[PDB]
Design a protein around this nucleic acid. Sequence first.
DNA 1: TCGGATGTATATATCTGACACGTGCCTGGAGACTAGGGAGTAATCCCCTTGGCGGTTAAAACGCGGGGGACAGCGCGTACGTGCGTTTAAGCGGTGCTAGAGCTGTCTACGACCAATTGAGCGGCCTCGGCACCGGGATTCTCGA
DNA 2: TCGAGAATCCCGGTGCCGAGGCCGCTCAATTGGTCGTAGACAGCTCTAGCACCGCTTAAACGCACGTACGCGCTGTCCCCCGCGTTTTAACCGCCAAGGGGATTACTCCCTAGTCTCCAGGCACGTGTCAGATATATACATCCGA
Lengths: 358, 94, 94, 97, 98, 85, 81, 109, 109
Amino acid sequence: DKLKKVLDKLRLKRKDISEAAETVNKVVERLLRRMQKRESEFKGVEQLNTGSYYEHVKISAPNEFDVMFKLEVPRIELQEYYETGAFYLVKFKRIPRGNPLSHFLEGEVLSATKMLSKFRKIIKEEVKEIKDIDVSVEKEKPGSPAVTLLIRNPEEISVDIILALESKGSWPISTKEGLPIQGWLGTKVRTNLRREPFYLVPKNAKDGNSFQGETWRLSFSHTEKYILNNHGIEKTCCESSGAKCCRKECLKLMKYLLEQLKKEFQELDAFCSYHVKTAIFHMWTQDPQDSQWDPRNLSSCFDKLLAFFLECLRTEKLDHYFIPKFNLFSQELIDRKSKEFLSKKIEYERNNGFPIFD
Amino acid sequence: RSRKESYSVYVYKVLKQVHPDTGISSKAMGIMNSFVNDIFERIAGEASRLAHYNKRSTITSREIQTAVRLLLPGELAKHAVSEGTKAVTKYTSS
Amino acid sequence: RSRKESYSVYVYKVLKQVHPDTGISSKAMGIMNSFVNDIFERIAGEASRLAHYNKRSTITSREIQTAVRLLLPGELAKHAVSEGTKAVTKYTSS
Amino acid sequence: PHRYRPGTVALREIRRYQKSTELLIRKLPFQRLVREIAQDFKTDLRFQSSAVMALQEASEAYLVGLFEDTNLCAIHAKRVTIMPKDIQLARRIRGER
Amino acid sequence: KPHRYRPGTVALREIRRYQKSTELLIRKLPFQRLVREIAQDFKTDLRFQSSAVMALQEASEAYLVGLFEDTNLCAIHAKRVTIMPKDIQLARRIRGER
Amino acid sequence: HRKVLRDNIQGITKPAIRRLARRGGVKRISGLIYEETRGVLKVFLENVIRDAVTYTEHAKRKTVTAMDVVYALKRQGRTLYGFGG
Amino acid sequence: VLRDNIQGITKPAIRRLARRGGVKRISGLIYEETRGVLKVFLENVIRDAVTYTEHAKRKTVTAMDVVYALKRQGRTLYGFG
Amino acid sequence: ARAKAKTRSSRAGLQFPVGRVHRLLRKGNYAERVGAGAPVYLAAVLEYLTAEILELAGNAARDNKKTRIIPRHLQLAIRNDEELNKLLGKVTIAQGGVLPNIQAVLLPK
Amino acid sequence: ARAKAKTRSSRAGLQFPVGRVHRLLRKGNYAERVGAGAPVYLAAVLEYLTAEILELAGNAARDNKKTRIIPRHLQLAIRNDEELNKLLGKVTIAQGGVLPNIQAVLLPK
DNA sequence: TCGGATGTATATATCTGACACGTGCCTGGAGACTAGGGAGTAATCCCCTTGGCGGTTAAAACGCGGGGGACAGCGCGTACGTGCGTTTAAGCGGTGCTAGAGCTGTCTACGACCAATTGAGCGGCCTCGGCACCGGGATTCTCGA
DNA sequence: TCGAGAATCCCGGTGCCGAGGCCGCTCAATTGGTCGTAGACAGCTCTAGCACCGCTTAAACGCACGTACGCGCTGTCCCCCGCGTTTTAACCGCCAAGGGGATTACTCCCTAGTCTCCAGGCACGTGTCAGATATATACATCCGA
Ligand SMILES: [Zn+2]
């Protein structure tokens, strides 16, 4: 059927991106070596591996990539910003030796503006020293914290570099009810996952001039990668001595559906792949059995996912999987009329054999 | 049966705010109880001696602040002093 | 003019019984004064803590005797205890 | 035969005993010693168990500290062994004699 | 030929002389200046009664003399007669001040 | 069975001294450490137990409760945490 | 303000302090360490004395203040009050 | 009509009790009359210090995959710092162990 | 008619005052109520200790032909004993000097 | 440099007991009120801290020659680490007793408190003799031949 | 084992300033009662310390071997001592000004003391999940050839 052909095409797409991805990894690794050799406050920076396959990355053009550089910081303190904990403020507790980041403080709070400014400056200095491949830094885009590399070898590649802080302390109290897979992968696996650090990525809120450049959101890219690659109740699920399921195939179909609709209808700009991943996480929790995801029944499983999403559209409610009070479908994030538009598009595609996949 | 008073419940409450999923074994409860008692004793004794040197006869917040500034070594003094001042202000406001 | 109290006269009286022709210079008076104050402080503090451990609320001679038995090292304890008991008996007789 | 060279089992035993937390002196001999010493000051005394435990813990801590400082002196005097001159010097510096 | 004691005799004569007197061994005015300099960092425009400076001087003298006694013991322990900085650092480490 | 006791200080065996030393970070123990260690332990125990027994005798009792030993230790700057307070 | 006063503790003064202690042959690197040790000790004592005076609302660090600061660290001093 | 009871710990936003500390101050013979502002300050300071110890111990316990806290973890938390180790430089913790430490000269060539 | 005054130091056969010690005990916040037998005991103990120090110092002063007592003599008296030196093992005496002492190895052959 | 031997970290499966949580109740903490004494604030007195000048000689600073102590190297011997085999007594589980720790209930004596009275001790004078200082002589201890 | 020299002890005489005693006088210690509670003492209950017995086996004891470290001896060379000469700043004596400590009055508001009432925290009981334990691996490290 059309769906299997689409899967084949999606899979064949990795070949056209593999060489660019390799050049990107080469450049990034050179940059990391440079950053680790020089003496500065970013000496401990490292690449966070978040996956490079179509399933792991956000929707992107085939020659656009993103990487996260993680940094270590001692004993931070988090102050909630909203009522749902969508944003967080970072402050510092007692340090005996003296805070090495003292001169980046603004009042009691760490200034993201200063850190990104220094990060960008350092990147510009080191990228100037890469002599064998033409790598420069794109002019800073006001409103985007990424430092964007432009690589010309000889075709133009864009790499958005996002600085991410890493904290080894306790997980925030808001996430107490998050990750409800106690019945899906057992309690011990949940505990082992919750015994791991968490990440903070700079993000401005859309709430006035005050505190702009001083707000951060949580990142759990490691746990999500782990769950994606270890997703069965059976230890051998999707392994070489186990049986395949269609969980990732369904994810790919819905992500590609959204990608094509967003391409066709710029009305859909405010939707992203994170909504799809959250929805499918909820479905994987509701239907934990591998037999509820047989590849033979891929299309039927996809349809049962579609119906849930339409109801998610209709109630304007989609709780963040890690932060239950964080409603991804709030009025403020996505206008009701955009969701009604998406509903109409989804019903059209479902009733006409998905012509947008053509 | 005479029946005693300790600091078990309060220490447990404070623990449930900075590590929302760990427990604590009874031996550690005994240790923390004794530690709280000892610090309270040291601070109160120092405050009493201070109030007696200046011929005063009362303990205001100011003597407690000076005693804390004398015992705790280093930056702990600064942090604890700030915490105390904030708490007493928030109490007096209402 | 406020006007203070010390132990000069008493120390001088005690000196005039064990060396009937020597004097003592003012610096030594200061030293002996401070020494008397310090010993009195140590003994009284120990007695107070003892009286508080047993839930009592008073200081009898017995707590002072136990405190002396705890501080002074060695045979000094025996001699001082005997002196105290003799004095208190001679006082209570009349 | 697989004899280790001298100076290896000692380092293994250090790496192990500096990591556990149990008690290192047998119990009953220590209890007998405590009662023997106590008899001189007063006759027919009865001990709670927790009192004996407290005495044992304090004694272990004291001895461990003393041996650490003795080892420091022994290294300072260009050696590796420890001998009673070391212990006497440590106790004389700390102010207990 | 001029008369000259062999090395190591005036040392013992001066030990015998100094272990017997009582007056102070640090010049007054330099110590007063040093005390005022150090107090400058915690408050501004302080005024010291003279006896306070005297008390500080006596305490410092006693502390240093104790330290040198213990250092000399450590030095003699290691088949020497000359004290060196490692001796002082060892003495302060054992005594518990570090 | 008020049987008096004698020569129990030999109960602190040789391997016990060895293990205590190993915890401290030593590598070669000479052959005369044992007597010095036993002497030091005897002195320390005497000093603690005398004050413990005085604290008991003050309160008209025959049982040396652990809280008394904690007080006796605390009086010599060896505060002990974990046995009541 | 004042600067470079630690060089007021001359070398002969340290020689005399050592001689009272019972030392025979002082090396040549002792002075640079004795000065540091003395500086640390004075810093601690003076900080405690100034805290007492600041609390009492005064501007004159009297002898009793230094005596109390000394007594706090277990170095009692007899002979000033 | 009496207004509804409202504990002082609530009005101060603390966790340690304040009434209990006030009673202990009054009936311990520290001074003749205890001001009304002291107990709040003292409770705040105690709470802060206990928060410090518990947080550090919790980190060290989660380090080696244990849910609870046992005295070894408390000893590890206290002995590593630079100020806490100076505030408790005389205190023995039962069943505490010691810090791993081997001198530099003993190790073989 | 009131009987003639008779000080308590007289009825106890002491030299240190007893009224003054009683006042100090009451107004120092040591306990709620001070028994009536404590001051006599405490004054006796203080008198005995001062007698000890003064007698030893006087002997040492008459040793080298001086009529008065100066701090050096007090330091000599205290530092020679075996128990007094242990009761005052932490106390510095102003203008006290030290005990004559030279090690055994430094002396020439 | 390598392979064999040994020791330690890891994953899995199974039990068991202590800790996290309800539940009932009780006593001490909070609310409202009243009284009085400690402390805060303003004003005045005088003393003792800072600041400076100028002369005097004691001590610090610099430089020089050389006797002796720190240090490295080597060689030798005994004594303490390692391992194996044997003998002693420590844990451990379980009885069984009773001494004394702890609690409750009366009831007497004694320490706080108050009021009037008076003499011991403190501050402020005076005064002379114990000691610091000078200077000369005798005694002793160190060094080279 | 001795002269020669340099440093210290002994001793006789002088000057002064600090210790010792005297005189007001005022404020704290005494005497004399009253009372309301804290400590003394008897009597009862029930926990917890002591004493004992059999056994299962982990730790202590004892002996052999030999290798690495403690200790003693030699040589050497550079750093610290002793002394002389110059140069600097500590000391001592005397003014002179004024910030600040110390004392007095007075008045007001904050804390002690009571009485009532109601909820926070403690003793008790319970059920299940975290950790201890046993066994089989898989990997890290040391030692001779
Ligand atoms: Zn699968």
